[PDB]
Fold this protein.
Amino acid sequence: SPILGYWKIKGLVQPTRLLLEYLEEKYEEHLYERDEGDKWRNKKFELGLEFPNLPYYIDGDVKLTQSMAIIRYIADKHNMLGGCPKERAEISMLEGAVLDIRYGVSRIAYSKDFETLKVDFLSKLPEMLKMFEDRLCHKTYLNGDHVTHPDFMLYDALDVVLYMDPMCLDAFPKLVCFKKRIEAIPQIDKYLKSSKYIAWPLQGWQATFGGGDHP
Amino acid sequence: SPILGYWKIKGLVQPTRLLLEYLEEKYEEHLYERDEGDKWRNKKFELGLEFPNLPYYIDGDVKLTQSMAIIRYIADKHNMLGGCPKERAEISMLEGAVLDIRYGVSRIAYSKDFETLKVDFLSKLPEMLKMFEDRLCHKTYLNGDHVTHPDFMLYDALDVVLYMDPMCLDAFPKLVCFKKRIEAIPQIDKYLKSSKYIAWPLQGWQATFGGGDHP
Ligand SMILES: *SC[C@H](NC(=O)CC[C@H](N)C(=O)O)C(=O)NCC(=O)O
Ligand SMILES: *SC[C@H](NC(=O)CC[C@H](N)C(=O)O)C(=O)NCC(=O)O
Ligand SMILES: *SC[C@H](NC(=O)CC[C@H](N)C(=O)O)C(=O)NCC(=O)O
Ligand SMILES: *SC[C@H](NC(=O)CC[C@H](N)C(=O)O)C(=O)NCC(=O)O
Ligand SMILES: *SC[C@H](NC(=O)CC[C@H](N)C(=O)O)C(=O)NCC(=O)O
Ligand SMILES: *SC[C@H](NC(=O)CC[C@H](N)C(=O)O)C(=O)NCC(=O)O
Ligand SMILES: N[C@@H](CCC(=O)N[C@@H](CS)C(=O)NCC(=O)O)C(=O)O
Ligand SMILES: N[C@@H](CCC(=O)N[C@@H](CS)C(=O)NCC(=O)O)C(=O)O
């Protein structure tokens, strides 16, 4: 059974969890708690990883790090990355545009100056969201009728920015619908209600925004 | 003929240029100068881009943004991304590990506190480089005998960190060799000597590190 290792937080790996659950894939997790740095450090170089880091994904011979390599691998095994170079590039474009939002948050979330930095981020956020709002015209998911991994990435990004500004989707009804559509996927509905769902923190526990043991 | 648009800097797009040149692909560039923000802003929404941004790559019907989508697209058209999910994931892992170095620089390069932040980055850099040093044991390129896009990404990262600390590869002879190997690829040798090579800046011109009109 594959092993997905990360801090017991949403962070970089939450879209991967959602994708695995969507696919009904069997996996176990190594979940490092806030005080378990020592535990991670004692395993870091003992797992066969060529590029030791968190998250990791171990699947027989396959030992992977890099969150994006991992999510894309799971997707790839299910024939989800795209049917030709142009569609693969389209999906990678969606992926990167989501990361501009999600990393946009993480870039500032650990700063002493988060509250001032938040102003600048929220000023740019509507422009980024509008691109997705436009993309969703006449589409159920970002690539139309079928789910792709960026859908779970975008889902996670929306979850996160809504904590930062609960009104940030008020101008984007299609994105509001989209978030509900993901939540309506029966596998996702079940997961979000399950003992396996990690609601919080959004970032590493030490973050100024999206950190701490509880919201 | 495809169009690659970016600021006239190395920045996010330099590995893409190197890959195109390696492949002997025909392309033209839209190169925005330091004072040409207005020019970019007047084109940004007039190019058919679904996710307007820099860089962009326009190839007939195909209008792409996201630097990583673009480099991977060029690679994909040349059957370079990997022969199966595991190899594709391996290549995406290399890609992400390079980005930890290259984005590691960009994260701090625009800060007023760059000089203090540099200490922390240079403290972590040897650990990141060692993973690549180990990977290159008995290999010509990162994936062995054949070039892949992360080779050009790593090349660009080494170029950049050597400006920050010219001694940072003193402990990593295989990486030193690697950088020279890339420079010895005849297409790359020619490109680096050509009028098309943009030597500087490394970052946006306004950066504290790797900015300005000249080094
Ligand atoms: S991957 C094969 C090509 N399809 C697409 O590019 C799909 C585009 C959208 N992502 C979608 O509609 O889902 C292909 O061969 N298309 C036929 C063509 O017009 O050439
Ligand atoms: S999908 C966005 C546009 N449609 C609408 O606004 C119709 C009203 C719907 N209730 C809604 O989606 O808001 C649209 O079709 N834009 C593209 C076009 O060709 O006009
Ligand atoms: S949210 C689902 C989409 N409807 C609208 O955008 C209308 C929004 C209302 N005007 C509002 O709440 O303000 C939609 O068109 N969905 C169709 C689809 O194929 O996704
Ligand atoms: S993509 C097909 C598989 N090959 C690899 O994974 C290549 C691994 C390295 N990147 C390399 O050697 O270049 C494959 O089918 N391998 C055969 C097997 O052992 O199953
Ligand atoms: S590739 C690194 C190891 N080889 C050497 O150190 C031999 C000397 C060479 N001049 C050099 O590469 O430095 C090596 O083989 N490590 C793996 C192993 O199986 O020992
Ligand atoms: S740099 C090329 C590799 N040689 C070494 O690592 C030895 C380095 C010296 N000890 C030194 O300069 O300090 C190498 O083994 N290359 C073979 C390959 O297949 O790449
Ligand atoms: N580019 C990497 C970044 C990984 C990373 O920064 N991981 C942090 C957690 S968010 C960590 O704790 N890494 C463990 C380590 O470096 O030992 C990825 O996307 O996986
Ligand atoms: N995730 C994007 C980031 C792109 C980006 O930040 N581009 C900057 C230059 S480094 C820019 O000037 N963008 C133009 C714009 O936003 O209008 C990518 O990798 O392409």
